[PDB]
Amino acid sequence: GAGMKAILQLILEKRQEFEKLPCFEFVRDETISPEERLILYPCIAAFALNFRDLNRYDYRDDNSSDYYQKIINIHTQEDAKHWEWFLNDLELLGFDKTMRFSEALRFVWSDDLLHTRRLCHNIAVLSHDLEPVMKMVVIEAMETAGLVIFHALAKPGESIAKATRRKYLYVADSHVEVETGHTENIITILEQTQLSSEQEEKAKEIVNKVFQWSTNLIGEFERYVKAHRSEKAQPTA
Amino acid sequence: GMKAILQLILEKRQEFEKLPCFEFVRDETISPEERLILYPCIAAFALNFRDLNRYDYRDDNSSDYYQKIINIHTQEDAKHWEWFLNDLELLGFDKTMRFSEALRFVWSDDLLHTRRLCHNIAVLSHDLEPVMKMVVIEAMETAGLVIFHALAKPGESIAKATRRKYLYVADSHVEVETGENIITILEQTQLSSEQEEKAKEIVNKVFQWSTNLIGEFERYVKAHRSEKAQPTA
Ligand SMILES: N[C@@H](Cc1c[nH]c2ccccc12)C(=O)O
Ligand SMILES: N[C@@H](Cc1c[nH]c2ccccc12)C(=O)O
Ligand SMILES: [Fe+2]
Ligand SMILES: [Fe+2]
Ligand code: NI
Ligand code: NI
Ligand code: NI
Ligand code: NI
Ligand code: NI
């Protein structure tokens, strides 16, 4: 229908806005050392394990016989493994520092990482009463934002991986490629689905919110970078 | 109506109070440092509870009478996370560790129910009218008073033995938590049939999620029997 085609087109329009945010200009700027462009990496601590939990406990319904939910379960199973990759690159980048337990807690629950820490919370709340087809729209919008972020972060990440001869897993092309997926992708199923008028309206609200919340997270990354521009990652060769 | 909902909260409290974790915590034949082995588990909850109170309960864009008094109470409850960080240091649990060891601790599969308690309350609360939010908050505060009445027993024993001011596992926390109140307003309120059935669901959920957290605290103590508090004189 024109319903589903309007939804997928809205995700494209939001993606095109989202790709142009200042953070991503900065992350992509090869005239700044990759070490300085990845100074935002530790901020991901407020999101990456929350995302694991979103996939394990909010998206997944192991019991459902529903066609759409079974496809979600398969995809979420894989997407919930990426937090280990985050902790891998956290160490390689020199950001796995020894600190007091309270300093780690005060960092994650920083007022400067509120939108970062609440992105998966907001998605869980949006998703609580959605039928599987509508969760698929949530996941497609959220994955579209994710691919923009990690396509950008993989640029300095692959520069450091090549130079230090270390295998990066999270800020790395392998993450982008595995995430994109190539049994069927959600975007294939969505292209074969028609939405009611209510569903079409709910899908608009979903795409708008997922992109607004993702932009709020990126906003906090930009302000963290501004506060740390004299600092850099310290990868070991 | 309400009377039935206030009576279920007291029934749930009397059941909750009997959990094996609370018998362990109140056992004065066990050193208080051993009974507060569970204290660092509170890291997965205390700052989430701050956020629940700042962001999920509170609505700074409402004019409703019930929502106004909620906002007031959530203001005070949102300050106790600093007391948690105070007592963490006093008990010798503010350990130097890798950032990743802190993250792997809070996001432990053994603290799933502890970490998801506030999340579960936010999902439960997000579409509730304010009177029903008051029911969530009253049940939650009833469960919290059982826990902190028990924790303050070994807390105040260490506080006196070491002459340090404890703030979280301490009588002062139990006293300000308790001290117009929400219960006053609920006693004077008439629940429709539909609100009555939902208030029942809220009170059952708040106490089941709280029991699940307490279960994880008990399993933690058994899996870390060495890692007793190390307060200093
Ligand atoms: N790929 C990310 C998850 C992710 C999906 N969508 C996002 C949007 C914003 C930030 C992160 C994400 C990870 O493995 O952790
Ligand atoms: N008083 C607790 C909060 C609390 C209320 N109800 C609870 C139930 C379980 C655990 C904690 C709580 C604090 O300041 O952190
Ligand atoms: Fe990922
Ligand atoms: Fe409290
Ligand atoms: Ni996938
Ligand atoms: Ni392939
Ligand atoms: Ni109060
Ligand atoms: Ni809702
Ligand atoms: Ni352990």
Numbering used by the authors:
A (entry chain A): -2 to 179, 183 to 237
B (entry chain B): 0 to 178, 184 to 237
Authors' text:
Akak et al. conducted biochemical analyses and confirmed that Fe(II) is required for AetD activity and the nitrogen atom in the nitrile is sourced from the α-amino group of the substrate instead of exogenous nitrogen or the enzyme residue.
Notably, we demonstrate that the AetD-catalyzed reaction is independent of the bromination of the substrate and also solved crystal structures of AetD in complex with 5-Br-L-Trp and L-Trp. We also solved the crystal structure of AetD in complex with 2 and 3, which reveal that these compounds bind in the pocket as that was observed in AetD/1/Fe. In addition, the structures of these complex crystals without soaking with Fe ion were also solved. These complexes harbor the same metal ion coordination statuses as that was observed in the AetD/1 structure, which provide additional evidences to support the conclusions regarding the formation of the diiron cluster in AetD/Fe complex crystals. Notably, 2 lacks the S214-mediated interaction and 3 forms even fewer contacts to the enzyme in comparison with 1 and 2.
